[PDB]
Symmetry: C3
Subunit: 153 residues, 3 copies
Amino acid sequence: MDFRIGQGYDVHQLVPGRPLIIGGVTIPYERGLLGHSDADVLLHAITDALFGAAALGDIGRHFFKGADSRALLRECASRVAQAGFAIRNVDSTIIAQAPKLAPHIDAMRANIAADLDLPLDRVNVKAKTNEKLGYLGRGEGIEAQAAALVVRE
Amino acid sequence: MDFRIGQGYDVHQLVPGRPLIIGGVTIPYERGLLGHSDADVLLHAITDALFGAAALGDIGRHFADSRALLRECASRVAQAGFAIRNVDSTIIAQAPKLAPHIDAMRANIAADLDLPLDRVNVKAKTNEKLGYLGRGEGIEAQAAALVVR
Amino acid sequence: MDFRIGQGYDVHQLVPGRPLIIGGVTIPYERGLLGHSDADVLLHAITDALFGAAALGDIGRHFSDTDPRFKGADSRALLRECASRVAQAGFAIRNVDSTIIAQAPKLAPHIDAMRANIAADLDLPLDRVNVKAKTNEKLGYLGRGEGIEAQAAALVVR
Ligand SMILES: NC(=O)c1cn[nH]c1NCc1cccnc1
Ligand SMILES: NC(=O)c1cn[nH]c1NCc1cccnc1
Ligand SMILES: NC(=O)c1cn[nH]c1NCc1cccnc1
Ligand SMILES: [Zn+2]
Ligand SMILES: [Zn+2]
Ligand SMILES: [Zn+2]
């Protein structure tokens, strides 16, 4: 009954000449997210929520030589398990004015579920626009938010 | 002990010409939220948090005013096997003052979710004059929900 | 078995001539957060998450920004009083997680000290308190260093 909650936030700029990768899914689009990594904003938010729930700090405290964000999410899951926690569920929201993310959501859930060794019914991803407000509304970046529940076994 | 958490986000533009409805409450103001129906930013965030906790997707996958949608959301969460344990939320608006209307929103939300009043919370924040929120160009809501098998 | 979750959000402007105090830590910096109190954005977010989890409203309900008794108020004192009211309502705190978002200064060197302050104020062990530090990847007013934001989540049990 030693439950813990975590929350994660990430945002990346949208830039020309890079693939758009969110939740491990490559999405056709003229721009992609900027970062040292593949800049997977969704996977980063989830990673931080998981580190947060296990009180293990954040991505900056932990991170891998040219690794993509799925390898990092897998490693995050590893460190969470190492600290004696089991993951109960993940929920998240992606905020992007464009492109449409709906057709890709189930693939993202499947990717996250595989990376965390969770059944699909314990992983959720939601898609939002920013109603044309601010930098998200102008399509200058994409934000992700995440929440994670774990239990110390 | 099969608990799940969910989280929700919503924002709408604040424009002259529409009524301001937040948490089912019509609030007198020179401007209102722009959306498909009543643009109830608070109920939308809560609805998303509930679907998220149940891993049922989001508002767009499932879906009338926003209270009707919240009630249908709650029905679907119940059918998926989940009981709602609590909801917490924050509205971010530079104006008007929301404090007077909080109990009314909590009452509407608790009714729609068939929850005791003490399992529903709504908080109110300004954006300290920063950004589109701080300039009164929109209103944001954030929600968290805990459910159980 | 009566668990509840809460979430909190806060933002304050960054201005010259104010102490920069985040998570109870005075951080050397040429600007600080503007507010009625010491403007501790992180502690406020956590305070709101705790009040939210207990369904006790928000920091404005409990510690009004128009009340002169809270002018320059120590947000750690506010957080302890919040924790006291949450306990009085019948709740025990299980954990806190949080994020600070700031273009500058570097927060990594101060995070452990913030964690320790929050754990002290909530009478929790360090391993139930987490503070994460983020930039906004150069976007928006946060990217321009006009303010600093904090987010928090709390789990309690009645
Ligand atoms: N403290 C940290 O460095 C930190 C905390 N969370 N993520 C971090 N760094 C990696 C990063 C940076 C920017 C965007 N996405 C991921
Ligand atoms: N995927 C979705 O459509 C979606 C996810 N959450 N809400 C959605 N659409 C309804 C909506 C849209 C804009 C503002 N408020 C509510
Ligand atoms: N309802 C409220 O006033 C309220 C809800 N949360 N914080 C509030 N006011 C105090 C405050 C104000 C500005 C920055 N930080 C804290
Ligand atoms: Zn990132
Ligand atoms: Zn909406
Ligand atoms: Zn504050």
